[PDB]
Amino acid sequence: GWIFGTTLDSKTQSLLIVNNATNVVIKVCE
Amino acid sequence: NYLYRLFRKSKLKPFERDISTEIYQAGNRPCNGVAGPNCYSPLQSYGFR
């Protein structure tokens, strides 16, 4: 997986993609 | 109940949302979360009547 964002300090929306060999979980909130 | 952002340090890319609430730095002294000279809230409320 990969994390994305600008500052990653719970001040802006941070894209997160997680693979666990069963699905892909994508979330946007900090 | 309706707010619009009037102060920002750049221009948005197309189809972008920014909902951060930090005090805008319009001068030299840091705001540190406290309003004052050259330090304004980025979101101004509408005045619908």
Ligand SMILES: *[C@@H]1O[C@H](CO)[C@@H](O)[C@H](O)[C@H]1NC(C)=O
């Ligand atoms: C995204 O964040 C960076 C980091 O401060 C900033 O320089 C840039 O202007 C931001 N992008 C937009 C479209 O505001």
